[PDB]
Design an enzyme around this catalytic site. Structure first.
Site, PDB file in Angstrom:
ATOM      1  N   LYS A  33       0.836  -1.220   0.000  1.00  0.00           N
ATOM      2  CA  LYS A  33       0.000   0.000   0.000  1.00  0.00           C
ATOM      3  C   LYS A  33       0.878   1.282   0.000  1.00  0.00           C
ATOM      4  CE  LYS A  33      -1.973  -1.653   3.744  1.00  0.00           C
ATOM      5  NZ  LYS A  33      -1.530  -3.096   3.594  1.00  0.00           N
ATOM      6  N   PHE A  36      12.689  -5.480   3.825  1.00  0.00           N
ATOM      7  CA  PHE A  36      13.617  -6.262   4.605  1.00  0.00           C
ATOM      8  C   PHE A  36      12.858  -7.111   5.638  1.00  0.00           C
ATOM      9  CE2 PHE A  36      15.928  -5.440   8.858  1.00  0.00           C
ATOM     10  CZ  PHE A  36      16.629  -6.661   8.857  1.00  0.00           C
ATOM     11  N   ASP A  42      10.460 -12.049   7.676  1.00  0.00           N
ATOM     12  CA  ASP A  42       9.278 -12.532   8.398  1.00  0.00           C
ATOM     13  C   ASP A  42       8.533 -13.676   7.636  1.00  0.00           C
ATOM     14  OD1 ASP A  42       6.040 -11.853   8.777  1.00  0.00           O
ATOM     15  OD2 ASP A  42       7.131 -11.878  10.689  1.00  0.00           O
ATOM     16  N   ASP A 102       7.672 -17.194   9.489  1.00  0.00           N
ATOM     17  CA  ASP A 102       6.269 -17.578   9.635  1.00  0.00           C
ATOM     18  C   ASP A 102       5.816 -18.659   8.678  1.00  0.00           C
ATOM     19  OD1 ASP A 102       6.170 -15.714  11.619  1.00  0.00           O
ATOM     20  OD2 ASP A 102       5.087 -14.133  10.532  1.00  0.00           O
ATOM     21  N   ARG A 162       2.686 -13.129  -0.549  1.00  0.00           N
ATOM     22  CA  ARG A 162       2.831 -11.764  -0.023  1.00  0.00           C
ATOM     23  C   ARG A 162       2.526 -10.779  -1.122  1.00  0.00           C
ATOM     24  NH1 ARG A 162       3.128  -8.991   4.643  1.00  0.00           N
ATOM     25  NH2 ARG A 162       4.392 -10.645   5.599  1.00  0.00           N
ATOM     26  N   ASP A 222       7.241 -11.993  19.750  1.00  0.00           N
ATOM     27  CA  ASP A 222       6.279 -12.687  18.877  1.00  0.00           C
ATOM     28  C   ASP A 222       6.701 -14.206  18.776  1.00  0.00           C
ATOM     29  OD1 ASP A 222       4.399 -12.298  16.039  1.00  0.00           O
ATOM     30  OD2 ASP A 222       6.007 -13.799  16.021  1.00  0.00           O
ATOM     31  N   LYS A 277       6.814  -4.781  17.845  1.00  0.00           N
ATOM     32  CA  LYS A 277       7.016  -5.388  16.511  1.00  0.00           C
ATOM     33  C   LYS A 277       6.385  -4.543  15.421  1.00  0.00           C
ATOM     34  CE  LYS A 277       3.173  -8.653  15.645  1.00  0.00           C
ATOM     35  NZ  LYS A 277       2.839 -10.013  15.131  1.00  0.00           N
ATOM     36  N   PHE A 298      -3.600  -0.996  14.372  1.00  0.00           N
ATOM     37  CA  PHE A 298      -3.300  -1.455  13.007  1.00  0.00           C
ATOM     38  C   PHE A 298      -2.952  -2.960  13.022  1.00  0.00           C
ATOM     39  CE2 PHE A 298      -1.814  -1.001   8.665  1.00  0.00           C
ATOM     40  CZ  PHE A 298      -0.735  -1.888   8.561  1.00  0.00           C
ATOM     41  N   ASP A 352      -4.550  -6.315  11.255  1.00  0.00           N
ATOM     42  CA  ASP A 352      -3.737  -7.326  10.556  1.00  0.00           C
ATOM     43  C   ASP A 352      -4.035  -8.755  11.051  1.00  0.00           C
ATOM     44  OD1 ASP A 352      -1.508  -8.023   8.631  1.00  0.00           O
ATOM     45  OD2 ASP A 352      -0.754  -8.848  10.542  1.00  0.00           O
ATOM     46  N   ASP A 353      -4.217  -8.898  12.348  1.00  0.00           N
ATOM     47  CA  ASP A 353      -4.577 -10.225  12.915  1.00  0.00           C
ATOM     48  C   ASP A 353      -5.948 -10.644  12.430  1.00  0.00           C
ATOM     49  OD1 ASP A 353      -2.104  -9.966  14.142  1.00  0.00           O
ATOM     50  OD2 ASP A 353      -2.896  -9.743  16.161  1.00  0.00           O
TER      51      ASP A 353
HETATM   52  C1  LIG Z   1      15.274  -9.022  11.222  1.00  0.00           C
HETATM   53  C2  LIG Z   1      13.836  -9.386  10.953  1.00  0.00           C
HETATM   54  C3  LIG Z   1      13.693 -10.849  11.254  1.00  0.00           C
HETATM   55  O1  LIG Z   1      13.037  -8.642  11.880  1.00  0.00           O
HETATM   56  C4  LIG Z   1      11.680  -8.473  11.658  1.00  0.00           C
HETATM   57  C5  LIG Z   1      11.007  -8.874  10.434  1.00  0.00           C
HETATM   58  C6  LIG Z   1       9.622  -8.636  10.282  1.00  0.00           C
HETATM   59  C7  LIG Z   1       8.866  -8.021  11.355  1.00  0.00           C
HETATM   60  C8  LIG Z   1       7.468  -7.766  11.288  1.00  0.00           C
HETATM   61  C9  LIG Z   1       6.808  -6.858  12.169  1.00  0.00           C
HETATM   62  C10 LIG Z   1       5.433  -6.707  12.092  1.00  0.00           C
HETATM   63  N1  LIG Z   1       4.705  -7.453  11.173  1.00  0.00           N
HETATM   64  C11 LIG Z   1       5.287  -8.352  10.379  1.00  0.00           C
HETATM   65  N2  LIG Z   1       4.545  -9.080   9.521  1.00  0.00           N
HETATM   66  C12 LIG Z   1       3.103  -9.412   9.819  1.00  0.00           C
HETATM   67  P1  LIG Z   1       2.346 -10.163   8.371  1.00  0.00           P
HETATM   68  O2  LIG Z   1       3.082 -11.353   7.855  1.00  0.00           O
HETATM   69  O3  LIG Z   1       2.415  -9.201   7.046  1.00  0.00           O
HETATM   70  O4  LIG Z   1       0.865 -10.523   8.683  1.00  0.00           O
HETATM   71  P2  LIG Z   1       3.004 -10.541  11.287  1.00  0.00           P
HETATM   72  O5  LIG Z   1       3.905 -11.886  10.931  1.00  0.00           O
HETATM   73  O6  LIG Z   1       3.507  -9.843  12.518  1.00  0.00           O
HETATM   74  O7  LIG Z   1       1.492 -10.911  11.275  1.00  0.00           O
HETATM   75  C13 LIG Z   1       6.689  -8.493  10.419  1.00  0.00           C
HETATM   76  C14 LIG Z   1       9.564  -7.664  12.520  1.00  0.00           C
HETATM   77  C15 LIG Z   1      10.966  -7.862  12.717  1.00  0.00           C
HETATM   78  C1  LIG Z   2       3.125  -4.719  10.406  1.00  0.00           C
HETATM   79  C2  LIG Z   2       2.545  -5.573   9.348  1.00  0.00           C
HETATM   80  C3  LIG Z   2       1.057  -5.938   9.385  1.00  0.00           C
HETATM   81  C4  LIG Z   2       3.370  -5.974   8.169  1.00  0.00           C
HETATM   82  C5  LIG Z   2       2.469  -5.731   6.907  1.00  0.00           C
HETATM   83  O1  LIG Z   2       2.196  -4.266   6.683  1.00  0.00           O
HETATM   84  P1  LIG Z   2       1.239  -3.704   5.504  1.00  0.00           P
HETATM   85  O2  LIG Z   2       0.061  -4.459   5.887  1.00  0.00           O
HETATM   86  O3  LIG Z   2       1.525  -2.302   5.946  1.00  0.00           O
HETATM   87  O4  LIG Z   2       1.992  -4.239   4.260  1.00  0.00           O
HETATM   88  P2  LIG Z   2       2.288  -3.515   2.808  1.00  0.00           P
HETATM   89  O5  LIG Z   2       3.611  -2.910   3.042  1.00  0.00           O
HETATM   90  O6  LIG Z   2       2.231  -4.709   1.976  1.00  0.00           O
HETATM   91  O7  LIG Z   2       1.140  -2.555   2.699  1.00  0.00           O
HETATM   92 MG   LIG Z   3       4.132 -12.822   9.095  1.00  0.00          MG
HETATM   93 MG   LIG Z   4      -0.201 -10.837  10.249  1.00  0.00          MG
HETATM   94 MG   LIG Z   5       5.560 -12.607  11.912  1.00  0.00          MG
END
Ligand SMILES: CC(C)Oc1ccc(-c2ccnc(NC(P(=O)(O)O)P(=O)(O)O)c2)cc1
Ligand SMILES: CC(C)CCOP(=O)(O)OP(=O)(O)O
Ligand SMILES: [Mg+2]
Ligand SMILES: [Mg+2]
Ligand SMILES: [Mg+2]
Ligand SMILES: CC(C)Oc1ccc(-c2ccnc(NC(P(=O)(O)O)P(=O)(O)O)c2)cc1
Ligand SMILES: CC(C)CCOP(=O)(O)OP(=O)(O)O
Ligand SMILES: [Mg+2]
Ligand SMILES: [Mg+2]
Ligand SMILES: [Mg+2]
Lengths: 346, 346
Positions: B50, B91, B96, B100, B105, B167, B193, B232, B236-237
């Site tokens: 987005k 990154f 992530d 996960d 994505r 997490d 996070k 936010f 997402d959850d």
């Molecule tokens: C160095 C690296 C491993 O560190 C990070 C990489 C990703 C993230 C992070 C933080 C917040 N949201 C995400 N992704 C979401 P998402 O996969 O988009 O639903 P989450 O798995 O928390 O539901 C990733 C936080 C730290």
């Molecule tokens: C913190 C998190 C939900 C990671 C995904 O963030 P977004 O939903 O802002 O992702 P995009 O960068 O794909 O919009």
């Molecule tokens: Mg994830």
């Molecule tokens: Mg998520």
């Molecule tokens: Mg995660």
């Protein structure tokens, strides 16, 4: 001599490093479990190597700063910045052992192979990277060289990742890549993946901390140190296959991982057509019998004797470079490091 | 409104970002293959979300700096720093999705699931991180806020990794962890996070670029923005399970990954003993039939309706916080972001 001297003091400072990085729990109990994980990550992955890079920071600092300016706080900043390069190293190895499918490191099972860790080690590794900048802030923020150290650690990481990217591109799993294993490519890989962070970075850090910030001075030190780093990686390649793993602390994977190792490049320069075939059919595969075939080929080609000749010629060349470029820095700064790595077995 | 306006301009600047990061090939042909890999990594992983965070930098910048001070170079620095937060995001997601075990994505297969990529994506991700600091150097090095931006990106990463560590600790594979799924723990996880890098970081970057560097001002903005970030993450959850994946661009894994999701915490607050059992026997496992059992339980408990109530109460509270803490900043800075995320479906 001088490294052996400093080792135990350097290593003794690790407790404080752990204590300072785990002290920001005091005010935020809510991150307690994460900080306890961080401490386990630090203890497991920052300890048990040679500490050559952290010690180089400390030794070089002591040799470059007038002893009258080496007060309690100055010295602490120096072994904190040494520890920063150790933390960079730890970050890199943890991630690298995942990418290389390694089994052991520094005499124990790789962090990511511990039951319960697995690919969570990816986050663990990055935390170790974040710790560097926390320590630089906490100890050097008021110093004239603070920005210089930050840009130097950030640039060194970028250059090392670029090198790691060339390492992984030249070594595809499932594909022959013999045509890419050239002397030229080899030099480019090791210059970026090893030489900048393992040789230039620690001496350059100590230079900036001693107020030695001129570009000419840094370029001179770099000429010696990049060559030292290329040599050091050639020894690492040699050890991957020919070292004793209860000495090196790690099992080798270069042949299984299809890597552009110094050994394969040499092998190639000397192989007959039929040996080239042996290499083609056997290199870059997980089969124990195929790895053994490659090793037998290396030993058939006297590669251990070729490594011993290169090591001598190269050390001589590095010593010539020292005679050319050390001034105005003391040659001991460079020689102490050369002698720490010349003829090493681990 | 204002984000929708700026989207296409923001996205159009991505070519230059790619061009500048790939221009340091000119002088060093030897890194050519790595720089070509970097460009493929950028195109695949920095595009298609987005751009809420990068755009927040640009929108906030435009709203905080006097238009007479918004010359060609100033604006370019602003959408470069917006792009820096996008690269941080890239990154993080790449790493992530590996941790996960994700599949898709932004509407395509996760980078690490592409044949030929695999765990090499670990290096790819870190390169994206290194690109942030290269861009800050190349565009903002002469600016009074340069150090401020560097420490802000480095601190935000550390805080986000600490959160990612909470997490992963709260969600062990193979183990029940129901006792740990508390409201309290949930809040601590998402604060670190998500909230710091996704809400505070972009507005704070634009503040520092507008010369707004006071601690009180930053603490006020943080009070709004951390609450916005918690909200936010709750959305997402909710979307991980109840969103349409041709809309969200990603398949959910929270229930399979044993995650401390807002949904499981709510489920727990309302479960009878027998439903608690259903959750215990079915949560955190890869079996499709067991994931479906958990979903049916959530829907049985009207969790979608509970999410819609929380979302309204929370938005109202965030708006109260805006009324309290926006001054002296324009409330539009915060409202433009709230309205971009209130009731979002992706
Ligand atoms: C160095 C690296 C491993 O560190 C990070 C990489 C990703 C993230 C992070 C933080 C917040 N949201 C995400 N992704 C979401 P998402 O996969 O988009 O639903 P989450 O798995 O928390 O539901 C990733 C936080 C730290
Ligand atoms: C913190 C998190 C939900 C990671 C995904 O963030 P977004 O939903 O802002 O992702 P995009 O960068 O794909 O919009
Ligand atoms: Mg994830
Ligand atoms: Mg998520
Ligand atoms: Mg995660
Ligand atoms: C972000 C992370 C993936 O980046 C890096 C991680 C590790 C390295 C690196 C550089 C030089 N040597 C190593 N390790 C050696 P080693 O495993 O100890 O023999 P190599 O696999 O090159 O033989 C790792 C470089 C970059
Ligand atoms: C560059 C490289 C060979 C990685 C291993 O370096 P090292 O051999 O310096 O490792 P220690 O930190 O374990 O001494
Ligand atoms: Mg390795
Ligand atoms: Mg490697
Ligand atoms: Mg090796």
């Amino acid at each position: 001599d001088v490294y052996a001297q400093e080792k135990q003091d350097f290593v003794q400072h690790f407790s404080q490093i752990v204590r300072v990085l785990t002290e920001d729990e005091m005010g935020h109990p809510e991150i307690g479990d994460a900080i306890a994980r961080l401490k386990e990550v630090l203890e497991y992955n920052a300890i048990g190597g040679k500490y050559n890079r952290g010690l180089t920071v400390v030794v070089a600092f002591r040799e470059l700063v007038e002893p009258r300016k080496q007060d309690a706080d100055s010295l602490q900043r120096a072994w904190t910045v040494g520890w920063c390069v150790e933390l960079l190293q730890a970050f890199f190895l943890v991630a690298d052992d995942i990418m290389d499918s390694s089994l052991t490191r520094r005499g124990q099972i790789c962090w990511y192979q511990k039951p319960g860790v697995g690919l969570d080690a990816i986050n663990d590794a990055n935390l170790l990277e974040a710790c560097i900048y926390r320590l630089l802030k906490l100890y050097c923020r008021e110093q004239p060289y603070y920005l210089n150290l930050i840009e130097l650690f950030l640039q060194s990481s970028y250059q090392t990742e670029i090198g790691q990217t060339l390492d992984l591109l030249t070594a595809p799993q499932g594909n022959v890549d013999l045509v890419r294993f050239t002397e030229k490519r080899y030099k480019s890989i090791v210059k970026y993946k090893t030489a900048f962070y393992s040789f230039y970075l620690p001496i350059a850090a100590a230079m900036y901390m001693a107020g030695i910030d001129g570009e000419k001075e840094h370029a001179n030190a770099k000429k010696i140190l990049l060559e030292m780093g290329e040599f050091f990686q050639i020894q690492d390649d040699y050890l991957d296959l020919f070292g004793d793993p209860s000495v090196t602390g790690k099992i080798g994977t270069d042949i299984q991982d299809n890597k552009c190792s110094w050994l394969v490049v040499q092998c190639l320069q000397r192989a007959t057509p039929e040996q080239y075939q042996i290499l083609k059919e056997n290199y870059g595969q997980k089969e124990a019998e195929k790895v053994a075939r490659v090793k037998a080929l290396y030993e058939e080609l006297d590669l251990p004797a070729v490594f011993l000749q290169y090591e001598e010629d190269s050390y001589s060349h590095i010593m010539a470079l020292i005679e050319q470029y050390a001034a105005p820095l003391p040659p001991a700064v460079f020689l102490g490091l050369a002698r720490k790595i010349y003829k090493r077995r681990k």
